[PDB]
Amino acid sequence: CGDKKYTKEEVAKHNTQNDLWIIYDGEVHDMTSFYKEHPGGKVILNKAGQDATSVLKTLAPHVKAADVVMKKLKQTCIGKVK
């Protein structure tokens, strides 16, 4: 994830398909490039700029494809929440 720190407020500003961040386990992830390939479609924006930990750990599809979900998270961490 690195050393960059972000406040929840700043992360919230990245809530669009061309500027999409999400928080996972206190980590800030830039998912902008993933928008188009998200198997769930546009609904990924429902948590854009917000915490998606529970969703990513418990939603049926996310569990079935946990390998893909974690791989994508591990390619997108830009910092942590402070």
Residues forming the site for ligand HEM (CB under 6 A): 22, 31, 38-41, 43-44, 46-47, 52, 55-56, 59, 61-62, 65, 68-69, 72-73
Q: Residue with CB nearest ligand HEM? A: 40
15 is in an annotated binding site: no
**Beta carbon nearer to ligand HEM, 10 or 25:** 25
Q: Is 58 exposed, middle or buried (0-12, 13-18, 19+ CB in 10 A)?
A: exposed
**Least distance (Å) between residue 79 CB and ligand HEM:** 16
38 is in an annotated binding site: yes
46 is in an annotated binding site: yes
Which residues make up each annotated binding site for heme b?
38, 46, 62
